[PDB]
Amino acid sequence: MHPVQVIAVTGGKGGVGKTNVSVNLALALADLGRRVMLLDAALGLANVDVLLGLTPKRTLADVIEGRCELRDVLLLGPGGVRIVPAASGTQSMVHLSPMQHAGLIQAFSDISDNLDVLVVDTAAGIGDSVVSFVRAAQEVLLVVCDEPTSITDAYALIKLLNRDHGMTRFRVLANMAHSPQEGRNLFAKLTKVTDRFLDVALQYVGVIPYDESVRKAVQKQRAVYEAFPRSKASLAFKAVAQKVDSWPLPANPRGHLEFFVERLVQHP
């Protein structure tokens, strides 16, 4: 028994590689030796199963519609990572009430085997589902690219969270950067904007290089960590995962709704 670390991968801007970061970070953390569960919070449109080549028989639409419980929709994905699949264009998953998000987050407490890693792949945008899944996670990892639109969207998400929920600690990961100096400069620009308007704490995690092996892996419907384990992107993901494993574990519950409050209450 131990507290479970929950990582929300977000960034607001679409097409920045949130799903790739989620999947590859999950496989890398499983490689270091943790029991990892990956949740596809893109509830209306599923991409984790597409990138990993999985064809789930039961998805979360079956859980919400009540045909099955939450345990029997788990899939054993690559590297031992257990996947919670989402629906793809199901009318009962396009938009859910905050009560339904609360119920789904609370129902995850039935799982008591993962080794303090639960990676949550939020959808694009700053909508209600994204905010609900980010606020429920201990760590918030923002994937940003070196474009004005991505910086603006990340700043908007940070400003929303800080203004309306008081969040102040954010992790930033650069993706599709053509040089380490590009990632450093991107972090510098994001921090410049945030310091100019806000008072929040941004921590640089690392950089994932632009690598065409990722594109080949997506075309093959497999993960770049397992399809091309010796590529630059795979090594960057391994380094980031080593950095992520060194993050401090949660110790005290907060007042709002969050994943696995049971383990955060009884253990201390």
Binding site: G66, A102, G103, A107, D199, P248, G255, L257
Partner: protein
Amino acid sequence: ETKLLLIDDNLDRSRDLAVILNFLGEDQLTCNSEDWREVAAGLSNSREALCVLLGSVESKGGAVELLKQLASWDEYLPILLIGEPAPADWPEELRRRVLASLEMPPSYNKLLDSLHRAQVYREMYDLFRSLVGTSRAIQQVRQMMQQVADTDASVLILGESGTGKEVVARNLHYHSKRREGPFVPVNCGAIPAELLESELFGHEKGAFTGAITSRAGRFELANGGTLFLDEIGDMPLPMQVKLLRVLQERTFERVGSNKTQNVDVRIIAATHKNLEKMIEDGTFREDLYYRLNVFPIEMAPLRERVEDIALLLNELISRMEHEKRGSIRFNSAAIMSLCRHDWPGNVRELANLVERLAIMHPYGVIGVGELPKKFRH
């Protein structure tokens, strides 16, 4: 707790006072001028003697010498005469300890005014590590916590935003009989109004359009411990009514269920809003207010405890040694500049500033220009 010494060789008046103090609920030991040393030897220390009630003395030398060896016994031990007029020729050196001159039979009013004055002079003459500081406000808070932590009572922590109410609540819980129980925090301003009832009480398999499983609420999570309701002022009125009903009856029901469950929890509520004005405007319930206000603890803003900032800085840096995100040190000019700040959101901004400069410049030293903005002027 504290004993009283009555020194009188007049047995009739000695018995008179002895029954009076016994009636008045005051602990005392009967003494005379020749056996009081043995009684004094029976005392644990000089502190346990609140005062001495001096009466007629027949020992050699008189009352003047008698005060001498009590003075040698203790200089801080006050003296009051029983059934003797105020002196007019006794030495002046001893008149800083004659608090009052009572007459037999004594009166209820002046006896307690005499006893109150004795407590004041004794106070004048002479372990919450998480809360650090040296201001009068912080030690008053620590004393109030010491007084309330050992009893089962509803505590309400009043102050401003980011003043450190959760720390006070945790210290109260850890120094109580419920130390081995859980600590369940509930923030009413971080949960939507429609979710608060389901979060506090729980729900069954089907209670609403999103309930997909049966789970325990935070009252059941706090069974055998304390439930810390932060930001109680923004709780909706219907939820206020239901919370009052649960607190009164000691029983609650899950949403969508008809089974009554009992939970024994300690309520520690926190507020930054002026509740009394909210009852005046009808946005808060007065009955719930007086159920939660059995013991209020008022925290003081950091701008009113400015001499304490350096100790807070050292404490905050200290805890980062345990939660492993680095370390950082400060300069005297930087500390003085921080002390000269308004600080709205006192401890929250102090911790945010420390975390921000720790992640920004790790293992560094902070000068006046090292501060980011609006902190030096």
